[PDB]
């Protein structure tokens, strides 16, 4: 691990490095009492903007509170002055394309099993105001039963083949729409065994993606083809929403096929806060203590505003947790 | 793995991805008969420029023919036009600094144990005209005994300024042997201290520190060891210690090498060896090949020649 990074994080002793990249270093953690395996992601906190840290600490608080069978579970977070430590579900089946490579290309039935896992996880996270924004194959981890866990939700604040044109142009984009594009590209790869946009040269690849023209092989069924074209759509306004996707017959036709699907976790019911009076004193207090919410008045404003936001989401998650 | 990559490499079945980065993607491989595990590194030849591809394939050709107990063994090389597949020794003990984290800092005696492994491996590779040039802690793998295997020799052109000598940081022409010595000094310091000699929260300032080359040497570091570190982390590459000097150092003191020979004339060139060299691929310009074999200088062309000659022997 990095120099000066503790040998223990909470009850977890740090063992070998599992992997690393720009968003941090991952080590295997062992619980000192129960000896359970976790993956611990270590993030350097000194090299982040304060606005970034705020956004991150917010998404983190949400992710710690929710659970989905196809989202890598964030169990806890630990902080010292320099390093942030994320305690994550430990999975070791590899990544989704390892499976794809072995098969060459997947049948529409198998591709769709994976697609339903991915869409379900995205729908869930989007419902809690969390977009991925950087969805790519290495984020699609496999457990031992060959089921997906999507990793790295909320890490974006800290590749071009899977990015939508608006991301490639560094424009200000809808996160949900970016995830839809990325999922389209991944669905394509599952069905074809090749990418819709590829080039030996970077500069050329970027233009292909921005242009958004790709060829679909005949062996992709027409129902599925109409789904792919709606997702891999350059006009973000015209691009399918997750709502459109989940209403689509090809999608729906996959329910419990070939196998029964994991239990659907309950989504928290989020309501309006008409006035200061309707805010729970103990939940407000616990939120106010967090750090990213140290300014009580700005916290009150964000909770009472008409806008949907992560402040409201956290509040209702905590409220739900109390009951 | 990468799309378009093989499902089988020689007798090895490709399984899960082990890790990846700029220099390629590593997959777990399983021998279809013996069930022996290997690590298979996949590298995209097409993304590479002309001179880079050649430099890499030349060094891989040397690496596949030699073996040292502290260098990650390269067993073989396979190629489809799109991908190179490097079949490597499989190691899973973690990396050196995982050990360092558990201890905090090493005793001078324990640090010397690792240091001798590292220097031994580099002296072996340098003897075969191979410098690492990009030595960093994550290259220092551990097997199950907590012994070192240095990985990623030959990959530097496919590309951590904390470990790079000032000449490498400055992007100037340099002796690769001298760069490795600097990187080993920084690593040795880290094992003894549990902190880097040059560190900074901002990249720009870190490069400056490395270039100026001033660092704080803790009092608990023994003075003959302290003299070693000063000789290695020396900004003047002409003044910096050689591996030969390191191996004779009082603190330091406490595998078959093949020797390059001269080829005065074309008549001295074994036709079987040349044919094997022609078949490698990193030698497109065959006139340039011959010039390099007949030149007055040590080079990787001669090294490959003599490794092939010895192997036929």
Author numbering:
A (entry chain B): 9 to 166, 179 to 343
B (entry chain A): 9 to 167, 179 to 273, 285 to 343
Extract from the study:
The SAD (synapses of amphids defective) kinases, conserved across a wide range of species, play important roles in multiple phases of axonal development and function. Despite the diverse functions, the AMPK family members display similar structural organization, with an N-terminal kinase domain followed by a non-catalytic region containing an ubiquitin associated (UBA) domain and, in some cases, a kinase associated (KA1) domain. The C-terminal non-catalytic region of SAD kinases includes two short conserved regions, SCR1 and SCR2, which respectively contain the characteristic UBA and KA1 domains12731. In this study, structural and biochemical analyses of mouse SAD-A revealed a synergistic model for the autoinhibition of SAD activity by two separable elements, a newly identified autoinhibitory sequence (AIS) and the UBA domain.
To understand the autoinhibitory mechanisms, we first determined the crystal structure of mouse SAD-A fragment containing both kinase and UBA domains. This KD-UBA structure comprises a head-to-tail dimer per asymmetric unit, which is probably a crystallization artifact owing to its monomeric state in solution. The kinase domain of SAD-A folds into a canonical bilobed structure in which the N-lobe consists of a β-sheet and the prominent αC helix and the C-lobe is composed mainly of α-helices. A flexible linker connects the catalytic domain to the UBA domain of three-helix bundle. Distinctly, the SAD-A kinase adopts a third binding mode, mainly with the N-lobe of the kinase domain and weakly with the C-lobe. The KD–UBA interaction in SAD-A primarily involves two helices, α3 from the UBA domain and αC from the kinase domain, which buries ∼1,500 Å2 exposed surface area. Six conserved residues from the UBA domain pack against a hydrophobic patch at the C terminus of the prominent αC helix. Structural comparison reveals that the KD–UBA interaction in SAD-A brings helix αC into an orientation that is rotated outwards approximate 90° from that in the active kinases including AMPK ortholog Snf1 and the prototype PKA. The N-terminal portion of the partially disordered activation segment folds back into the active site, strictly preventing the formation of salt bridge(s) between Glu67 on helix αC and Lys49 on strand β3. Therefore, the distinct UBA binding mode and the inserted activation segment lead to a typically inactive (αC-out) kinase conformation, where the important Glu67 is 12.5 Å away from Lys49.
